[PDB]
Amino acid sequence: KKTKGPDAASKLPLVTPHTQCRLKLLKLERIKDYLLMEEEFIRNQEQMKPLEEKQEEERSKVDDLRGTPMSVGTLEEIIDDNHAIVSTSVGSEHYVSILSFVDKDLLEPGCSVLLNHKVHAVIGVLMDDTDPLVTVMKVEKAPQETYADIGGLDNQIQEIKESVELPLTHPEYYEEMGIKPPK
Amino acid sequence: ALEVVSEPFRSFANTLVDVCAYAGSGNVLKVQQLLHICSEHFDSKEKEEDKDKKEKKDKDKKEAPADMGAHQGVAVLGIALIA
Amino acid sequence: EVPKEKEKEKVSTAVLSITAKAKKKEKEKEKKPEPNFQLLDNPARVMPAQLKVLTMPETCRYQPFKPLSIGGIIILKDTSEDIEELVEP
Amino acid sequence: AKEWQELDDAEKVQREPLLTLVKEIVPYNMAHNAEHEACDLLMEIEQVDMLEKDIDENAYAKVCLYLTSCVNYVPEPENSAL
């Protein structure tokens, strides 16, 4: 998938005039207007469309079969189609049975595997095990500055722009000669 | 009003005609009212296929927000009409 | 005595922007018997709260010789015959 | 509008449109006529700022295009021999 997860930001397209002025007032009012429109629409459509015949009885069955407090364990040498070995956090090698809900693909050795608490059984795959000390380093509220805020560093800014922005802005410019973009 | 003389396809044409009118005239009154009613009156019953045209025409009357509200329309569209 | 089966399933608006002024201007432009003294049938229920405050209906030809402050079957005085509405449902 | 706006040729020019708009919305044409009877002509140079702000504002106006219509009639004289 390789999701190109952006900074999930830019919710401020940026007010053009910074001098207190009715132009600022009107523009920010437009911003608020669209934001309120979005809130209203999402709430209204959540309430409407009576799909209350939801839960897709079957998914309820799956949740039922996978009990409460599921545990996180590391999959290990997979033995048979309907059988595999798991290693709990205490490093104990149980021998569980892969139930049908689990896609036989996506379950490779070393991939964190969900389990049923009572009868250790691979119930589902987990593709989000990023170290909670590492996910805290993703910027999700883009700092509010623009290349115009910085000044007097033309030559020293063009150099970074030619290796952090242009290579993904117009990558044809680079391939046309075949030079690999500086990294 | 004169186009109120037909079946739900009259509502179709109503949405279409309002949209075809307000091409870039960014407003909130008509946009809000259509955005709301079109999807709050046609998804429940068998008669449907209107709730697509309003959003698919938010561009019209909004496609030229001095190139400012475009970055907001993108947010509303992408978040809502898909997710 | 009412089905009392109502259902809205609607969402109330929250539109609140500069557009409120246009809404207001356009709106201006566009706009520019009981019980406790009734009657009752003969074999009608009489609650004990009113078994002592009812009314004597003298219109018909007969009156109850028993004092009228209680409930229960009370045999009235027999007047002359040939009365009206001799009904025994 | 005729005196304080350009009291020293300062950035007060940006505020005169605000005043004349939030006020005299309907008689903005006439308020502008009184204001520009002398203020615009005393400095033909200032009119550029007025045109700039009105241009950047035309994209923003009331839901009903009475202002947008208003902000379209008004700029003609400014674009005129003024």
CSV table of C-alpha atoms in Angstrom, one decimal:
chain,number,residue,atom,x,y,z
A,1,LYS,CA,0.0,0.0,0.0
A,2,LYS,CA,2.8,2.4,1.0
A,3,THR,CA,0.3,5.1,2.1
A,4,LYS,CA,1.7,8.6,1.5
A,5,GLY,CA,0.3,9.7,4.8
A,6,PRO,CA,0.5,13.5,4.7
A,7,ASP,CA,1.0,15.8,7.7
A,8,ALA,CA,-2.9,15.7,8.0
A,9,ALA,CA,-2.7,19.5,8.3
A,10,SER,CA,-3.0,22.6,6.2
A,11,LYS,CA,-6.5,23.2,7.6
A,12,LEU,CA,-5.5,26.9,7.3
A,13,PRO,CA,-5.1,27.7,3.6
A,14,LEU,CA,-3.5,30.9,5.0
A,15,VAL,CA,-5.1,34.3,5.4
A,16,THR,CA,-3.5,36.6,2.7
A,17,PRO,CA,-3.4,39.9,4.6
A,18,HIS,CA,-1.8,40.0,8.0
A,19,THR,CA,-2.8,43.6,8.8
A,20,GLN,CA,-6.0,43.7,10.8
A,21,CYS,CA,-8.6,44.5,8.1
A,22,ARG,CA,-12.1,43.6,7.1
A,23,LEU,CA,-10.5,41.6,4.2
A,24,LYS,CA,-9.1,39.4,6.9
A,25,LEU,CA,-12.4,39.3,8.6
A,26,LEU,CA,-14.2,38.2,5.5
A,27,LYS,CA,-11.7,35.5,4.5
A,28,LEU,CA,-11.6,33.9,7.9
A,29,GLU,CA,-15.4,34.0,7.9
A,30,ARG,CA,-15.3,32.0,4.7
A,31,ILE,CA,-13.0,29.5,6.3
A,32,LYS,CA,-15.3,29.1,9.3
A,33,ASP,CA,-18.2,28.9,7.0
A,34,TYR,CA,-16.9,25.9,5.1
A,35,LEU,CA,-15.8,24.3,8.4
A,36,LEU,CA,-19.2,24.6,9.9
A,37,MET,CA,-20.7,23.3,6.6
A,38,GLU,CA,-18.5,20.2,6.9
A,39,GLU,CA,-19.5,19.6,10.5
A,40,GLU,CA,-23.1,19.9,9.7
A,41,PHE,CA,-23.1,17.6,6.7
A,42,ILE,CA,-21.1,14.9,8.4
A,43,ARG,CA,-23.4,14.9,11.4
A,44,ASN,CA,-26.6,15.1,9.3
A,45,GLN,CA,-25.6,12.2,7.1
A,46,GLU,CA,-24.5,10.2,10.1
A,47,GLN,CA,-28.0,10.6,11.5
A,48,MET,CA,-29.8,10.0,8.1
A,49,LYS,CA,-29.5,7.1,5.7
A,50,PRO,CA,-31.1,4.6,8.1
A,51,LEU,CA,-28.6,1.8,7.6
A,52,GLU,CA,-29.4,0.7,11.1
A,53,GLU,CA,-29.5,-2.8,9.8
A,54,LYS,CA,-25.7,-2.7,10.3
A,55,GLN,CA,-23.1,-4.8,12.1
A,56,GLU,CA,-23.3,-7.2,9.2
A,57,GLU,CA,-24.3,-10.2,11.3
A,58,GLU,CA,-21.3,-12.4,10.5
A,59,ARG,CA,-18.9,-9.7,11.6
A,60,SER,CA,-20.8,-10.0,14.9
A,61,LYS,CA,-20.1,-13.7,14.7
A,62,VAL,CA,-16.4,-13.1,14.1
A,63,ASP,CA,-16.1,-10.7,17.1
A,64,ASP,CA,-18.0,-13.3,19.1
A,65,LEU,CA,-15.5,-16.1,18.2
A,66,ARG,CA,-12.6,-13.8,19.0
A,67,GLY,CA,-13.1,-13.3,22.7
A,68,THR,CA,-12.4,-10.5,25.0
A,69,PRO,CA,-8.8,-9.4,25.9
A,70,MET,CA,-7.1,-10.6,22.7
A,71,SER,CA,-3.3,-10.8,23.2
A,72,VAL,CA,-0.5,-9.6,21.0
A,73,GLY,CA,2.1,-12.3,20.1
A,74,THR,CA,4.8,-12.9,17.6
A,75,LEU,CA,4.2,-15.4,14.9
A,76,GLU,CA,6.9,-18.0,14.3
A,77,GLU,CA,7.9,-20.8,12.0
A,78,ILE,CA,4.6,-21.7,10.4
A,79,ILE,CA,4.1,-25.5,10.4
A,80,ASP,CA,1.0,-26.4,8.4
A,81,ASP,CA,-1.8,-24.6,6.5
A,82,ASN,CA,-4.1,-25.0,9.4
A,83,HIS,CA,-1.4,-24.7,12.1
A,84,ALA,CA,1.3,-22.3,13.2
A,85,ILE,CA,3.6,-21.6,16.2
A,86,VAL,CA,3.3,-18.4,18.3
A,87,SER,CA,5.5,-16.8,20.9
A,88,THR,CA,3.9,-14.8,23.7
A,89,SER,CA,5.5,-11.8,25.4
A,90,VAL,CA,7.0,-14.2,28.0
A,91,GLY,CA,8.7,-15.9,25.1
A,92,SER,CA,6.8,-19.2,25.4
A,93,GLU,CA,6.3,-21.2,22.2
A,94,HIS,CA,2.7,-22.3,22.1
A,95,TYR,CA,1.4,-24.3,19.1
A,96,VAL,CA,-1.8,-22.7,17.9
A,97,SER,CA,-4.2,-23.3,15.1
A,98,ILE,CA,-4.7,-20.6,12.5
A,99,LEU,CA,-8.4,-20.1,12.3
A,100,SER,CA,-10.2,-19.3,9.0
A,101,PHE,CA,-10.7,-15.6,9.6
A,102,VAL,CA,-6.9,-15.0,9.1
A,103,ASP,CA,-5.7,-14.5,5.6
A,104,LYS,CA,-3.1,-17.1,5.0
A,105,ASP,CA,-1.2,-14.4,3.2
A,106,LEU,CA,0.1,-11.4,5.2
A,107,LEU,CA,1.2,-13.8,8.0
A,108,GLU,CA,4.9,-14.1,7.6
A,109,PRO,CA,7.4,-15.0,10.4
A,110,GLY,CA,8.1,-12.1,12.7
A,111,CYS,CA,4.7,-10.5,12.1
A,112,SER,CA,2.8,-9.6,15.2
A,113,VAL,CA,-0.1,-12.0,15.4
A,114,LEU,CA,-3.3,-11.6,17.4
A,115,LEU,CA,-4.5,-14.5,19.6
A,116,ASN,CA,-7.5,-15.7,21.6
A,117,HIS,CA,-6.9,-15.4,25.3
A,118,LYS,CA,-8.1,-18.8,26.5
A,119,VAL,CA,-7.2,-21.1,23.6
A,120,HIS,CA,-4.1,-19.7,21.9
A,121,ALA,CA,-5.2,-19.4,18.3
A,122,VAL,CA,-4.1,-17.0,15.6
A,123,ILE,CA,-7.2,-14.9,15.2
A,124,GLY,CA,-6.0,-12.0,13.1
A,125,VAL,CA,-3.0,-10.1,11.7
A,126,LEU,CA,-1.6,-6.8,13.1
A,127,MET,CA,0.2,-4.6,10.6
A,128,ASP,CA,0.7,-1.6,13.0
A,129,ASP,CA,3.4,-2.4,15.5
A,130,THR,CA,5.4,0.8,15.1
A,131,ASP,CA,7.3,1.4,18.3
A,132,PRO,CA,5.3,3.8,20.4
A,133,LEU,CA,8.6,5.6,20.9
A,134,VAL,CA,8.9,6.0,17.1
A,135,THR,CA,5.4,7.0,16.1
A,136,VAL,CA,5.8,10.1,18.3
A,137,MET,CA,8.2,11.5,15.7
A,138,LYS,CA,5.7,12.0,12.9
A,139,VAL,CA,4.7,15.6,12.4
A,140,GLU,CA,0.9,15.8,12.2
A,141,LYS,CA,0.4,19.6,12.8
A,142,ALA,CA,2.6,21.2,10.2
A,143,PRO,CA,4.6,24.1,11.7
A,144,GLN,CA,3.3,27.4,10.5
A,145,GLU,CA,6.1,28.9,8.3
A,146,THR,CA,6.7,29.5,4.6
A,147,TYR,CA,9.8,30.0,2.5
A,148,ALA,CA,8.9,33.7,2.4
A,149,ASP,CA,9.1,33.9,6.2
A,150,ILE,CA,12.8,33.1,5.9
A,151,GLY,CA,14.8,35.7,4.0
A,152,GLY,CA,18.3,36.3,2.7
A,153,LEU,CA,19.0,32.7,2.0
A,154,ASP,CA,18.2,32.3,-1.7
A,155,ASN,CA,21.2,30.3,-2.8
A,156,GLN,CA,21.0,28.2,0.4
A,157,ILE,CA,17.3,27.5,0.0
A,158,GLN,CA,17.3,26.6,-3.7
A,159,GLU,CA,19.8,23.9,-2.9
A,160,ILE,CA,17.4,22.2,-0.4
A,161,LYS,CA,14.5,22.8,-2.7
A,162,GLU,CA,16.3,20.9,-5.4
A,163,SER,CA,16.5,17.8,-3.2
A,164,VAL,CA,13.4,17.9,-1.0
A,165,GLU,CA,10.7,19.4,-3.2
A,166,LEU,CA,11.6,19.4,-6.9
A,167,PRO,CA,12.5,15.7,-7.2
A,168,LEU,CA,8.9,14.8,-6.3
A,169,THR,CA,7.4,18.0,-7.9
A,170,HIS,CA,8.7,17.5,-11.5
A,171,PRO,CA,10.6,14.2,-11.5
A,172,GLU,CA,10.7,14.2,-15.3
A,173,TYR,CA,13.4,16.9,-15.1
A,174,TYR,CA,15.7,14.5,-13.4
A,175,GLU,CA,15.1,11.3,-15.4
A,176,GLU,CA,15.4,13.1,-18.6
A,177,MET,CA,19.1,13.1,-17.9
A,178,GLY,CA,19.1,10.0,-15.7
A,179,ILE,CA,21.0,11.6,-12.8
A,180,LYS,CA,19.6,10.2,-9.6
A,181,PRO,CA,18.2,13.0,-7.5
A,182,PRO,CA,20.5,14.0,-4.7
A,183,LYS,CA,19.5,12.4,-1.4
B,1,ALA,CA,-41.1,26.6,-9.3
B,2,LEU,CA,-42.2,26.0,-12.9
B,3,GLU,CA,-40.1,22.8,-12.9
B,4,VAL,CA,-42.1,21.5,-9.9
B,5,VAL,CA,-44.6,19.8,-12.3
B,6,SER,CA,-42.9,16.4,-12.6
B,7,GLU,CA,-41.8,13.4,-10.6
B,8,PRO,CA,-38.7,13.2,-8.5
B,9,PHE,CA,-37.0,13.8,-11.8
B,10,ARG,CA,-38.4,17.3,-11.4
B,11,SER,CA,-36.2,17.5,-8.2
B,12,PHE,CA,-33.3,16.2,-10.4
B,13,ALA,CA,-33.8,19.0,-12.8
B,14,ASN,CA,-34.2,21.5,-10.0
B,15,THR,CA,-30.8,20.7,-8.6
B,16,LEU,CA,-29.3,20.7,-12.1
B,17,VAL,CA,-30.8,24.0,-13.0
B,18,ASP,CA,-29.7,25.7,-9.9
B,19,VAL,CA,-26.2,24.3,-10.3
B,20,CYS,CA,-26.1,25.3,-14.0
B,21,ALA,CA,-27.1,28.8,-12.9
B,22,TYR,CA,-24.6,29.4,-10.1
B,23,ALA,CA,-21.3,28.5,-11.8
B,24,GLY,CA,-18.9,30.6,-9.8
B,25,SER,CA,-20.9,32.7,-7.3
B,26,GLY,CA,-19.7,31.2,-4.1
B,27,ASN,CA,-22.5,31.4,-1.6
B,28,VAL,CA,-23.7,29.6,1.5
B,29,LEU,CA,-27.5,29.8,1.3
B,30,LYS,CA,-28.2,27.7,-1.8
B,31,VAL,CA,-25.1,25.5,-1.3
B,32,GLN,CA,-26.1,24.6,2.2
B,33,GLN,CA,-29.8,24.1,1.4
B,34,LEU,CA,-29.1,21.8,-1.6
B,35,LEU,CA,-26.3,19.9,0.1
B,36,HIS,CA,-28.6,19.2,3.0
B,37,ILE,CA,-32.0,18.3,1.4
B,38,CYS,CA,-30.6,16.4,-1.7
B,39,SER,CA,-29.0,13.7,0.5
B,40,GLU,CA,-31.6,14.0,3.3
B,41,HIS,CA,-34.5,13.2,1.0
B,42,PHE,CA,-33.5,10.6,-1.6
B,43,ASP,CA,-31.2,7.9,-0.1
B,44,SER,CA,-33.8,6.5,2.2
B,45,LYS,CA,-36.4,5.6,-0.4
B,46,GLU,CA,-36.0,3.5,-3.6
B,47,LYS,CA,-36.0,6.7,-5.6
B,48,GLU,CA,-32.3,7.9,-5.5
B,49,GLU,CA,-29.5,9.1,-7.7
B,50,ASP,CA,-30.0,12.8,-6.9
B,51,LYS,CA,-27.7,13.0,-3.9
B,52,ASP,CA,-24.8,12.6,-6.3
B,53,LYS,CA,-25.4,15.7,-8.4
B,54,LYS,CA,-25.4,18.3,-5.7
B,55,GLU,CA,-22.0,17.4,-4.4
B,56,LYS,CA,-20.8,16.7,-7.9
B,57,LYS,CA,-21.8,20.3,-8.5
B,58,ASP,CA,-20.4,22.0,-5.4
B,59,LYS,CA,-17.7,22.9,-7.8
B,60,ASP,CA,-20.3,25.0,-9.5
B,61,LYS,CA,-20.9,28.1,-7.3
B,62,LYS,CA,-17.7,27.1,-5.5
B,63,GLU,CA,-15.1,26.1,-8.1
B,64,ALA,CA,-13.8,29.7,-8.1
B,65,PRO,CA,-13.4,30.8,-4.5
B,66,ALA,CA,-10.7,33.2,-5.5
B,67,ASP,CA,-8.7,30.0,-5.4
B,68,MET,CA,-9.2,30.1,-1.7
B,69,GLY,CA,-12.2,28.0,-0.8
B,70,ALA,CA,-10.9,25.3,-3.2
B,71,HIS,CA,-8.6,24.0,-0.5
B,72,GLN,CA,-11.6,23.7,1.7
B,73,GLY,CA,-13.9,22.1,-0.8
B,74,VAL,CA,-11.2,19.5,-1.3
B,75,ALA,CA,-11.3,18.7,2.4
B,76,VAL,CA,-15.0,18.4,2.6
B,77,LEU,CA,-15.2,16.4,-0.6
B,78,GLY,CA,-12.4,13.9,0.1
B,79,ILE,CA,-13.4,13.4,3.7
B,80,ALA,CA,-17.1,13.1,3.2
B,81,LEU,CA,-18.3,11.9,-0.3
B,82,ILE,CA,-15.8,9.0,-0.2
B,83,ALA,CA,-14.8,8.0,3.3
C,1,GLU,CA,-56.8,6.7,23.2
C,2,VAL,CA,-54.0,7.7,20.8
C,3,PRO,CA,-51.5,5.5,18.9
C,4,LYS,CA,-48.8,8.0,19.8
C,5,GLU,CA,-46.5,6.6,17.1
C,6,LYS,CA,-44.5,9.5,15.9
C,7,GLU,CA,-41.0,9.6,14.3
C,8,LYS,CA,-39.1,12.5,12.9
C,9,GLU,CA,-35.6,11.1,11.9
C,10,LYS,CA,-34.4,14.6,11.0
C,11,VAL,CA,-31.4,16.8,11.7
C,12,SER,CA,-31.7,20.4,12.8
C,13,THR,CA,-29.7,23.0,10.9
C,14,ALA,CA,-26.8,24.8,12.5
C,15,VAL,CA,-26.1,27.2,9.6
C,16,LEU,CA,-24.5,30.2,11.3
C,17,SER,CA,-22.3,32.4,9.2
C,18,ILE,CA,-22.5,35.9,7.6
C,19,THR,CA,-25.4,34.3,5.7
C,20,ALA,CA,-27.6,34.9,8.7
C,21,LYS,CA,-28.0,38.5,7.6
C,22,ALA,CA,-29.1,37.5,4.1
C,23,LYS,CA,-31.6,35.1,5.7
C,24,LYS,CA,-33.0,37.8,7.9
C,25,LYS,CA,-33.3,40.3,5.0
C,26,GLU,CA,-35.0,37.7,2.8
C,27,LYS,CA,-37.4,36.7,5.6
C,28,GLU,CA,-38.4,40.3,6.1
C,29,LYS,CA,-38.8,40.8,2.4
C,30,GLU,CA,-41.0,37.7,2.2
C,31,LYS,CA,-43.1,38.7,5.2
C,32,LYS,CA,-43.6,42.3,4.1
C,33,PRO,CA,-67.7,20.4,28.8
C,34,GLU,CA,-65.4,19.2,31.5
C,35,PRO,CA,-66.7,16.7,34.1
C,36,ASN,CA,-67.7,17.4,37.7
C,37,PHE,CA,-71.1,18.9,36.6
C,38,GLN,CA,-72.2,16.6,33.8
C,39,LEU,CA,-74.9,13.9,33.7
C,40,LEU,CA,-74.6,10.1,34.1
C,41,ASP,CA,-76.6,7.0,33.3
C,42,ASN,CA,-78.4,4.8,35.8
C,43,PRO,CA,-76.0,1.7,36.1
C,44,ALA,CA,-72.9,3.9,35.7
C,45,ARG,CA,-69.8,3.6,37.8
C,46,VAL,CA,-69.7,6.0,40.7
C,47,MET,CA,-66.3,6.4,42.4
C,48,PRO,CA,-66.4,6.6,46.2
C,49,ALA,CA,-64.8,10.0,45.9
C,50,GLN,CA,-68.1,11.2,44.5
C,51,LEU,CA,-70.5,8.7,46.1
C,52,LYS,CA,-71.3,11.6,48.5
C,53,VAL,CA,-71.3,14.7,46.2
C,54,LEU,CA,-73.4,13.5,43.2
C,55,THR,CA,-76.7,15.1,42.0
C,56,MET,CA,-80.3,14.0,42.4
C,57,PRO,CA,-81.9,13.8,38.9
C,58,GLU,CA,-85.5,14.6,39.8
C,59,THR,CA,-86.6,14.7,36.1
C,60,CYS,CA,-87.6,11.1,35.9
C,61,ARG,CA,-90.7,10.1,37.8
C,62,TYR,CA,-89.1,8.2,40.8
C,63,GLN,CA,-86.7,9.0,43.7
C,64,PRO,CA,-84.5,6.8,45.9
C,65,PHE,CA,-86.1,6.4,49.3
C,66,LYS,CA,-82.7,5.3,50.6
C,67,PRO,CA,-80.5,8.3,51.5
C,68,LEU,CA,-78.1,9.1,48.6
C,69,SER,CA,-74.6,9.3,50.0
C,70,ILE,CA,-73.4,5.7,49.3
C,71,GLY,CA,-73.0,3.5,46.3
C,72,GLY,CA,-74.3,0.0,45.7
C,73,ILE,CA,-77.8,-1.1,44.6
C,74,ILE,CA,-80.5,1.2,46.0
C,75,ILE,CA,-84.1,0.5,45.3
C,76,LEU,CA,-86.1,3.6,44.5
C,77,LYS,CA,-89.7,4.4,45.5
C,78,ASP,CA,-92.4,3.0,43.2
C,79,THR,CA,-94.5,5.7,41.6
C,80,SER,CA,-97.4,5.2,39.2
C,81,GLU,CA,-97.0,2.9,36.3
C,82,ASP,CA,-97.0,3.8,32.5
C,83,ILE,CA,-93.7,5.5,32.9
C,84,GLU,CA,-91.4,6.3,29.9
C,85,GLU,CA,-88.3,4.2,29.0
C,86,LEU,CA,-89.1,0.9,30.6
C,87,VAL,CA,-85.9,-0.7,29.3
C,88,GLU,CA,-84.3,-3.9,30.8
C,89,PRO,CA,-81.1,-4.5,28.7
D,1,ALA,CA,-13.6,59.2,4.7
D,2,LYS,CA,-12.4,62.4,3.1
D,3,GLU,CA,-9.9,63.5,5.7
D,4,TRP,CA,-8.8,60.8,8.1
D,5,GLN,CA,-8.3,58.2,5.4
D,6,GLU,CA,-5.2,59.9,3.9
D,7,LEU,CA,-4.4,61.9,7.0
D,8,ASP,CA,-0.7,61.5,6.4
D,9,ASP,CA,-0.8,59.2,3.2
D,10,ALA,CA,-0.6,56.3,5.7
D,11,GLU,CA,-2.0,52.8,5.5
D,12,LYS,CA,-5.3,54.3,6.6
D,13,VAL,CA,-6.4,54.0,3.0
D,14,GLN,CA,-7.2,50.3,3.5
D,15,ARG,CA,-9.6,51.3,6.3
D,16,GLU,CA,-11.7,53.7,4.3
D,17,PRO,CA,-13.2,50.9,2.2
D,18,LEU,CA,-14.0,49.1,5.4
D,19,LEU,CA,-15.9,52.1,6.7
D,20,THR,CA,-17.7,52.9,3.5
D,21,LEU,CA,-18.7,49.2,3.1
D,22,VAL,CA,-19.9,48.3,6.7
D,23,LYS,CA,-21.7,51.6,6.5
D,24,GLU,CA,-23.9,53.0,3.7
D,25,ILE,CA,-24.2,49.6,2.1
D,26,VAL,CA,-27.2,50.7,0.0
D,27,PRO,CA,-26.0,54.3,-0.4
D,28,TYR,CA,-22.4,53.3,-0.8
D,29,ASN,CA,-22.5,54.7,-4.3
D,30,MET,CA,-23.5,58.1,-2.9
D,31,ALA,CA,-21.2,57.9,0.1
D,32,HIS,CA,-18.4,57.1,-2.3
D,33,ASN,CA,-19.5,60.0,-4.6
D,34,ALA,CA,-19.2,62.4,-1.6
D,35,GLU,CA,-15.9,60.8,-0.5
D,36,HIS,CA,-14.3,60.8,-4.0
D,37,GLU,CA,-15.6,64.2,-4.9
D,38,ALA,CA,-12.3,65.5,-3.5
D,39,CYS,CA,-10.4,62.6,-1.9
D,40,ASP,CA,-9.7,60.5,-4.9
D,41,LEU,CA,-8.8,63.5,-7.1
D,42,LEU,CA,-6.6,65.2,-4.5
D,43,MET,CA,-4.3,62.2,-5.1
D,44,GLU,CA,-5.0,60.1,-8.3
D,45,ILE,CA,-2.2,57.8,-6.9
D,46,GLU,CA,-4.3,56.6,-3.9
D,47,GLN,CA,-6.9,55.0,-6.3
D,48,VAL,CA,-4.6,52.1,-7.0
D,49,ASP,CA,-4.9,50.8,-3.4
D,50,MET,CA,-8.7,51.2,-3.6
D,51,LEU,CA,-8.9,49.3,-6.8
D,52,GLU,CA,-6.6,46.6,-5.4
D,53,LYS,CA,-8.7,46.0,-2.3
D,54,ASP,CA,-12.0,46.0,-4.2
D,55,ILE,CA,-10.6,43.6,-6.8
D,56,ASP,CA,-9.4,41.2,-4.1
D,57,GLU,CA,-12.7,41.6,-2.3
D,58,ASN,CA,-15.0,41.0,-5.3
D,59,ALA,CA,-14.5,37.3,-4.9
D,60,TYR,CA,-15.9,37.8,-1.3
D,61,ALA,CA,-19.3,39.3,-0.8
D,62,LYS,CA,-22.8,38.6,0.3
D,63,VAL,CA,-24.5,35.3,-0.7
D,64,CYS,CA,-26.8,37.4,-2.8
D,65,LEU,CA,-24.7,39.2,-5.3
D,66,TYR,CA,-26.0,42.7,-4.5
D,67,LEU,CA,-22.6,43.7,-3.0
D,68,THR,CA,-20.8,41.7,-5.7
D,69,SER,CA,-23.0,43.7,-8.1
D,70,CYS,CA,-22.3,46.7,-6.0
D,71,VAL,CA,-18.6,46.0,-6.0
D,72,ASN,CA,-18.9,45.8,-9.8
D,73,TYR,CA,-20.6,49.1,-10.5
D,74,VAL,CA,-18.5,51.1,-8.1
D,75,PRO,CA,-15.1,50.1,-9.6
D,76,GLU,CA,-16.0,51.5,-13.1
D,77,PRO,CA,-15.4,55.2,-12.2
D,78,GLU,CA,-12.3,54.3,-10.3
D,79,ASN,CA,-11.0,52.6,-13.5
D,80,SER,CA,-12.2,55.7,-15.3
D,81,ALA,CA,-10.4,59.0,-16.1
D,82,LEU,CA,-9.9,59.0,-12.3
